[PDB]
Amino acid sequence: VIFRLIQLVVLVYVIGWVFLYEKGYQTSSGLISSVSVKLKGLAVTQLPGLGPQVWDVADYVFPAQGDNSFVVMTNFIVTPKQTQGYCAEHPEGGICKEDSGCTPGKAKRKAQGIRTGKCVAFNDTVKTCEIFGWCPVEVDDDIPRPALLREAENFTLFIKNSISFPRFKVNRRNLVEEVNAAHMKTCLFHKTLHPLCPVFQLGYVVQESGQNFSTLAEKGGVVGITIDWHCDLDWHVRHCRPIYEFHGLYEEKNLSPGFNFRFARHFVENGTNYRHLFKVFGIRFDILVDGKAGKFDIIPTMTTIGSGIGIFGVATVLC
Amino acid sequence: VIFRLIQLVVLVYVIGWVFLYEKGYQTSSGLISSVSVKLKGLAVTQLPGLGPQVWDVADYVFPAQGDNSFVVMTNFIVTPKQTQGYCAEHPEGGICKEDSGCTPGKAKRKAQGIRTGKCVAFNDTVKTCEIFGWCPVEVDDDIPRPALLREAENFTLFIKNSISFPRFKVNRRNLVEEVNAAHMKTCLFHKTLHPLCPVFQLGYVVQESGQNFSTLAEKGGVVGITIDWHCDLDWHVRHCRPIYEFHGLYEEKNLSPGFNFRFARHFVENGTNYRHLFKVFGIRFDILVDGKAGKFDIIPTMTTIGSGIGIFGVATVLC
Amino acid sequence: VIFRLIQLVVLVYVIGWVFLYEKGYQTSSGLISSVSVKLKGLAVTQLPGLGPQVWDVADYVFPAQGDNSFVVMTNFIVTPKQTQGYCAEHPEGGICKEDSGCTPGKAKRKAQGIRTGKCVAFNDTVKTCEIFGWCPVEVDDDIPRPALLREAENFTLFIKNSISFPRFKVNRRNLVEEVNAAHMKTCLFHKTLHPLCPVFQLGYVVQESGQNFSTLAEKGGVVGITIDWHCDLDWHVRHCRPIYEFHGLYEEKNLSPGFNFRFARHFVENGTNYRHLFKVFGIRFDILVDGKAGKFDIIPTMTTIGSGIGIFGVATVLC
Lengths: 319, 319, 319
Ligand SMILES: *[C@@H]1O[C@H](CO)[C@@H](O)[C@H](O)[C@H]1NC(C)=O
Ligand SMILES: *[C@@H]1O[C@H](CO)[C@@H](O)[C@H](O)[C@H]1NC(C)=O
Ligand SMILES: *[C@@H]1O[C@H](CO)[C@@H](O)[C@H](O)[C@H]1NC(C)=O
Known about the structure:
By secondary structure, chain A is of the alpha+beta class. Chain A has helices at residues 2-21, 202-208, 213-219, 298-318; strands spanning 26-29, 32-40, 43-44, 54-55, 61-62, 69-72, 76-87, 105-106, 114-121, 127-135, 156-165, 170-173, 199-201, 221-229, 243-249, 262-264, 267-269, 272-280, 283-286, 290-291, 293-296.
């Protein structure tokens, strides 16, 4: 009865593995998603000399209107009131002992301005070639050991995610609407305790991504909040819930270069254009929503059955 | 002749259903899309006291450069010239009858600043704990019954969408280039009259999404403009046109919380940093482009035929 | 031996074409990607009268924090210190010889403000209807023949792209980490010389997209940098590298309208709100990352084999 043994193996594969395990009787379908991230949290910096400085959702969220891939500022370097005048160059670009060593015109590489050919003093001692550009130039030589926005670990990230599968015309929201009047705005996400709460503490998000928040709070980083949908639409639609997973992107063996984009707050004072050059060492959260809806379709079901007869056929022939 | 009857059912399924109906002889392929949204429209607000205030594409579009998921401001609450000084707190955060009820330091939850421990008067009567923060604090207690930007319903949304299917190396534009010199910039999209015109009135977009514009114009909302491509590349490439569909995202039983992001216009006056805190109740339009190109490929065609022989086989065996 | 000849053709198709050529023994899977674009480059404009004007990564990148679809400003038209007062209208909107020809209220189409009904002089000769709006109005009548930011062709676009295939739990970075201490920051991308260097010169990107940079530098354009991943995860993960391809989106027979979005730099002077209306003729780079990981899966392998037996079956029956 070797045929029966061979046929049983084929029958197990078609039913147990393809259908029961691999869900081969359903047509997988992707989703188009819309993510609305809402942040709550205020961070004070206690900056010496200047004093405390608060930062609300309008100031530490890039873009302000929110996006799938947004940035939460955790640290920054500010150059107050930059103007396009004549000043020294940063030593990293170049140094000079006399005006004869300063080549007129913009530098070939690492250019910070129009080198006028004059050697002026960036430091009390170090003298760098005068350049036409944003003055004073961005020093960017020290990163505050305690992150200026260190409180951002307590910031709550409310993610309002709406997905839809065009093939099956099924629309789902990351809010399962099981909340009650008292439970309203009284949950924080946890991988075990509250897997369905869409409110994420940033410190918890970074921690569950394998990255220490204090390391990312200073130099910046990128965290991928993958909202994974695995709707088995053969069942009821309420049984499909998002599975939030956090990944440390650009880890580089858990030593990331740190997300350190630069943005300016342009303003005009006394009729002269100025700007506030912020080198923001923020944590960029990317809501990489992925989905695979498995709904019973007669095409994969019957092709597998036909495949099975082919699988069963070839097998018994060989034996 | 029961075999012929069973075989006919299988033959109908393979040809009529899989091939003719389900297009099982073609390899479905997704697309990578690029969306360039152009808006035309000016909205006046006729704000009492201040007077009229115009809002052009530079001011009511977030982001300004445009994106797949952008926001069109339909209403806003403005806090003019916020400064990081010492003032009262919003009553929602907390209230106080005396300085002894104000806990020094930042509040555990619903924190709006650094509570100095002093109880000062937010209202003529209500007294809230003094907090270091953006002053004056955002009241956010009244929403203009007529939306400040109510004219946005007449705003035209010109969507320049370029898609491409990497598998088939076919590039398509939502502009079928059937326009003529006179027809240029003389069409508005309609689900029946002009299904191919890429210029969408925002009032029409919201209306066709099942949401009343006046409701969304005040508190904000999210509208999903799904540009659906269903190219049957077996035919000519000109026969593939976008199918624009509008969906009300986060409807919550047609009672949305309203998209109400906050952004600031930072500026410096008299050497002091200020900002204009706008709580924008805009309508966020997400251009969720989805595509499935069906081009004749020998792999799905012959696997179905092989599946068919398996389907036909198993059937006649059972009978 | 016609059967053997027919069987050989089927056997070649199943193995040679489906498996060896079309990789029909592997389950294709898409990827969720995160793109971090870093730009280096300073552009001077040598604007007559005003003088030189520098533009760094903080000023010519939209959005500042970076995104998959970002804009690099190559040209702009600036309207300094626009205010919401009473001034003339642009002639394109309308003209007038007397106040009786100016209809009070906002214009039905091409409206630039609240027409007060008075006919004032936009030009020394041309007289247009006074409108309440941003004053002075955007002329937008001349485009600098040499692009103000023409140096942007030398700008280096460092693209830090992290992808991941959720089905196979494989994370990849566009950085293959073959760099050495000396090679660090010493490469530029080339289609042949350096196919793996993630640093792209913008002039090279536009040139390889089939578009002349000088044409796009003036009126703007859209360039699609498709980072294509084709991981054959059956092999080692190091053998999968990104394939960068540049496409000219919205070419319109290689005559693009030019990406010409508008953004404003709002500021307050003397207690009055102003803005700097920039019509940016930038080049919008869209990082359209696409991926198809082929990893050996028993489902496509055995269904093809079963399909084959069906293919082989039907064939020999016909003959
Ligand atoms: C001299 O310039 C360098 C720039 O790298 C800076 O780090 C250093 O602090 C300066 N020295 C002093 C005494 O300020
Ligand atoms: C008192 O404060 C509340 C804050 O909720 C505000 O709504 C109300 O208008 C204030 N009362 C007066 C008389 O201004
Ligand atoms: C008159 O206005 C038009 C607006 O289209 C402008 O192009 C032209 O230069 C103006 N004439 C003068 C002499 O400024």
